[PDB]
């Protein structure tokens, strides 16, 4: 009993700082974050579809409300993809190290670690869902972009001139958000949480 | 009764398109709109007070989320106040009108009049309220103020990188919003609603 | 009983500022006023028929009297049309909102509002009639146009030279009048009067 | 009696074509016509007094309608006065003529003479009166003076737009009318009517 | 198992009343296996009823597709037996088996023709039991030479049902890697939480082979491991040998074989019984969230009809209203265990 | 010699058990020589057994390739004598010699055809003895004229074996420089530590020649020098003359020849015996280091199998393990003498 | 006051001393016939009274291709300057005819042929 | 604000006194048509109001190889300086045409042909 806990499951531990936080693990990981954005651009759109809504709305706060709501729902497609890509390297790493042949042990040893991944793949994915639904409850105006008055990531002309600038931004701009926000999520959750678990939840329960 | 309603109580009616919609409502109103901004400045704040909240979170999206809460709630004070200033002189004009002598007749005459407009002075305020409550919820990043990475307008790399630039400017800009939006608002609502009053409700009960 | 008065017949009220005074109601309404003039031009005439009368008359005040009288009667045709066009949007709006299904109520509720339109379509039309008859009693000279000495909207030559300019104006000129005067009428009466009524004559009688 | 009427009382007759129609009527008349205008200026007014009436109405056609009333009535004074000036010297010529000795004859002779012309001095004035009374009634907009939107010659958009330009000029121009019209008038009427007098009525009663 | 029974039945009735998809789809249990697995003995052991044709070698000699249907008339109907209705489940067994034995002899004669019978009873749960003929590689008795192919396709039409508890029985005197019993069975119910590999008739194996690594649970570790069984021979079955007897014959083999002796305490049918139940509970519970959401929406609907009574001048609702309330409550309680 | 015997046998058995190259390859002893060397007499003198055909002049008149093989059945097999098995080594000699003598006469008749015999006995060491016909230059008796070439090639197929102790016997009545006996022999075993040049039949030399310088050990000094011998004539051999007798005839010549008298005390077969043994020991010992290293590695291997038992959830080894231990110990002790 | 017509006509009998026959811009009204150097009217060649103006068919005129007609005052010798008649010439007969009818209207009457 | 087009055009009627016909760099927007000596815009030849600007097909122009067109203010005499119309000339007909359509967009409308 002593042998496995002491050597088999502790050198593997140092294995894990190694693999996750380092191509090797170092920039296998980084890779996924800066190739993720490409996904976003493709299966999303902005500009003139949103633009049409403006005219009816005005006849500024009252006008804004209906406009943005219906587009935001469609941002689901890309975001999910990032999550899965993360899973590949991490889920398979933990399990690689656990058998080390004998008669008594193993079984238990697996049971503690594997089930973690199930619970934590749900975290990240769920955070994506929430974020998307959020849009229809809010449509804030404090945010970030420029002022009024590839997807970016008779004298009627004078009348709409001013109003126009307000609405248009929010669709285009939201794309900027998702591309950075998804990766950030992963870092906390997918990556770190699991990294921790396997190192230690295994050992303590064993020895006792 | 058909003759009496048709003539006697419809000539009184026409009086009121005149004053309010083309002092009365016409130019009482203008005055209040351009002294309104002063209201705004007083019971509102920005800058480094807001920064205090940040320290609790940091010491990325989820942590940032809480910040504004109690501040956005406090922007009610000025906007609401404008409403009352308009109401005072204009609402009281219609209500004066029911005494125009017989003591048998007067008692019935009074009771019918006041109520409808009374409740619909509330309407106007409520639309302002909607915009305000909205504020508290999310704060993603695209809207006006500047990006991370008259009102003015270790692993640091993920966390603090964005946080720093956003917070301070952020509050200031929403103040910008209100000051212009209120005056517009009034034009549609206050003005017309009350106009209706005398024109019709006076007649109304008598038909039965 | 409470439900209908409170909600069904009060949100409809705000409905009415909306619909009348705003294509939507805003420029559905304006439309009718500036397309009305076309009606006038067609079914009216001036110039040389009137011109013939002058010569007998002189052999200036005495001459003028007989001349203009007989033409003015014929201006009836266009004027009426405007009235009806106004009716269409307004008469149908009020009734759209009144049923909201139940057993007790409704009946009464209709009875108060509908009959108003009958009485007020008579106002406007009657004002048109009066205005037309008026001409044969007056033929004033103070008015507006230029001085003496598509429908606009031997040495005999020296003798009629001066007189001529006086009479000729009045027919041509009257057309200018009607095109603007009819719309003005409507604004006060058709439009506003009815707008008022429905908002309020309904409610008060109900609650009591 | 046939012989007496035919000769004795017809040579007296012929005298009068002479003086009046080709001092007597001929050139008494001319003098009075070109000093007549002075009369006009005195007992008449225009400009800003008239504006007072406007304030009652406004603070569009119906309101404008009342204005002129009492002013147009006051334009009688000058026009009428001219009449009397002509009458004085000319009317009294015929009436002198009945004394031309026998005391038995004179008494019958006088009574027959005066009356007919007497009443028909009234005629002339009355035709002037007609034009004057007319004034009060309507005031639509085309005639001479300028449009909205020697005598000189909120929802503002519907109401005051037209009103402003009309009122002030308006009174002035009617004064223009009278000053020229009176002199013409006289030529037809005064002159001829009285001429008749002596030529025939002298004979008249005697035939029986 | 203590949460599962009561909660499931209660939910199922409420859904039935609403005319919805009741669901809570209880497993169909079927035995498939190579020739000489014992399969009907295994199936009847778990189910608890005697109604399956039994024999040695090839056991199921006609398909019995039995459907238990809760219904008020209480009878059963054979298509091919015009004018028979059994109410007694024992009687079903007696007629099927006895009539075959008298007419075919006791030399393994089989028939592919399924017996369509539906047993109506108010004392049962809505279940489907399917006894299936064994897939084979070599004929015995008067079986045709191409028996192998006919049986294999036939059984697949019934076994595709996703919630099919297969007790994959495979004769040790045939190669386990080339076993039809394992090939079919593992496809339909892979997980191994409720499949436990049962190898019979180890006494008939060729000298020089054994299943030692598999049966010892060390080559391929399973949570519950393996349990072998030694099923009743032809002679015993003929005399209506009772349920207990099969168990006894199992012991005798194990004692003399050196390679299986030490694993004797993790053997027997009874032990196999225990495992199956525990897994079942988990499956039901997971489907719960979906049902709940649908129920909520429907209820509100009819409120509007009441709503419209009250304002403008001139029992399906009730029944449904009540039913919905019930269903929602049950769902939550099962979720919290 | 006292370290060599025991240590060698002990090592050889341990290696046999492991199924490795036992080695410790004991010398094959073969006599080669010109015509009239005596060669079989010399070979049997050292070996200690009577089994070689003997004669004067040409001696080996058929090849006897004998292989001693330790084996349990105890017999021997002639290819050309279908259905004879000797167990008695004396009997082998008796049959070969007697049967030839009766049929060919006593006039030197020879035969190149080897006699394939393998003597199985448990009382022997794994050795190969090879008696070979003498290479010649002139025929005698009824030998063919081209005898010279046939014998020479034949003997070379057996004598190439690197550890072949050649007692290079050369007749003095032929020129030593032109001697076939020395040419072959010196090629295969050059060193001279275990080759001692034996010159026979000095009594038949031509008048006017002698081997004085060579035999005196002064021309070409050797550590053990030279030993001459005078072998048995034809007449003696015929009557089964015993082993001792050859030695006696040696003396007679030496006494009358002036040039060899003084070297008499460094003569005889017995003296030749002593030298051979001492050299042999050295050869074995040097090969020891290589064997040792291989043995160590193999042992460890199976430890890992034991290792893997203890940790992860579901007699060849023994035999070898013991054998290896033995071999390593023996190697060291021999090295330290 | 009213313009009856504006159209070019060639004054065919302009001296050597003034360029020769040049085209000038005619403007006729009911009271006068005025001609300028062009239609901007900054110039003023003259203004001829229509009073007592009469019109004649001028029998070919010079020995040229011009068709001539003339205006002449019935009550005096010269019509303007030292001319007797105002000679108007066109390169085609149709140009000459249309202008002749326009003079009719203005009080230039026919006869004296 | 928005640039409609930038492209060279030849001012064909520049006086003797200023080099003669030279090519100048045109910049048209929705509010003005400005032209510089070059694209660096350090210069400023002018800024002409687009207000009341209208466009005509200029019938060949001078007796040259240039194809001309012009901008002219409907409410006044000169368009800029002392010109009446702004003459733009190209060596080819295709150059003239593409610029004419770009003026259309800017509120220079057709007619008055």
UniProtKB/Swiss-Prot annotation, chains A, B, C, D:
Belongs to the TRAFAC class dynamin-like GTPase superfamily. Dynamin/Fzo/YdjA family. It is found in: Cell membrane; Membrane, Clathrin-coated pit; Cytoplasmic vesicle; Presynapse. Catalyzes the hydrolysis of GTP and utilizes this energy to mediate vesicle scission and participates in many forms of endocytosis, such as clathrin-mediated endocytosis or synaptic vesicle endocytosis as well as rapid endocytosis (RE). Associates to the membrane, through lipid binding, and self-assembles into rings and stacks of interconnected rings through oligomerization to form a helical polymer around the vesicle membrane leading to constriction of invaginated coated pits around their necks. This is Dynamin-1. Changing residue 141 to W: Significantly decreases receptor-mediated endocytosis. It comes from the Eukaryota. Disulfide bonds: none annotated. It is linked to Developmental and epileptic encephalopathy 31A: An autosomal dominant epileptic encephalopathy, a heterogeneous group of severe early-onset epilepsies characterized by refractory seizures, neurodevelopmental impairment, and poor prognosis. Development is normal prior to seizure onset, after which cognitive and motor delays become apparent. Homodimer; homodimerization is mediated by the dynamin-type G domain which promotes assembly-stimulated GTPase activity. Homo-tetramer formed from two dimers in the absence of lipid. Oligomerizes into a helical polymer that self-assembles around the vesicle membrane, when associated to the menbrane through lipid binding.
Swiss-Prot record, chains G, H:
Phosphorylated by CDK5 leading to synaptic vesicle endocytosis (SVE) activation. Residues 2-108 form the PH domain. It is found in: Cell membrane; Membrane, Clathrin-coated pit; Cytoplasmic vesicle; Presynapse. Homodimer; homodimerization is mediated by the dynamin-type G domain which promotes assembly-stimulated GTPase activity. Homo-tetramer formed from two dimers in the absence of lipid. Oligomerizes into a helical polymer that self-assembles around the vesicle membrane, when associated to the menbrane through lipid binding. Belongs to the TRAFAC class dynamin-like GTPase superfamily. Dynamin/Fzo/YdjA family. Catalyzes the hydrolysis of GTP and utilizes this energy to mediate vesicle scission and participates in many forms of endocytosis, such as clathrin-mediated endocytosis or synaptic vesicle endocytosis as well as rapid endocytosis (RE). Associates to the membrane, through lipid binding, and self-assembles into rings and stacks of interconnected rings through oligomerization to form a helical polymer around the vesicle membrane leading to constriction of invaginated coated pits around their necks. It is linked to Developmental and epileptic encephalopathy 31A: An autosomal dominant epileptic encephalopathy, a heterogeneous group of severe early-onset epilepsies characterized by refractory seizures, neurodevelopmental impairment, and poor prognosis. Development is normal prior to seizure onset, after which cognitive and motor delays become apparent. The dynamin-type G mediates homodimerization and plays a role in self-assembly. The C-terminal proline-rich domain (PRD) mediates interaction with SH3-binding partners. Is required for DNM1 self-assembly. This is Dynamin-1. The lineage of its organism: Eukaryota, Metazoa, Chordata, Craniata, Vertebrata. The gene is DNM1.
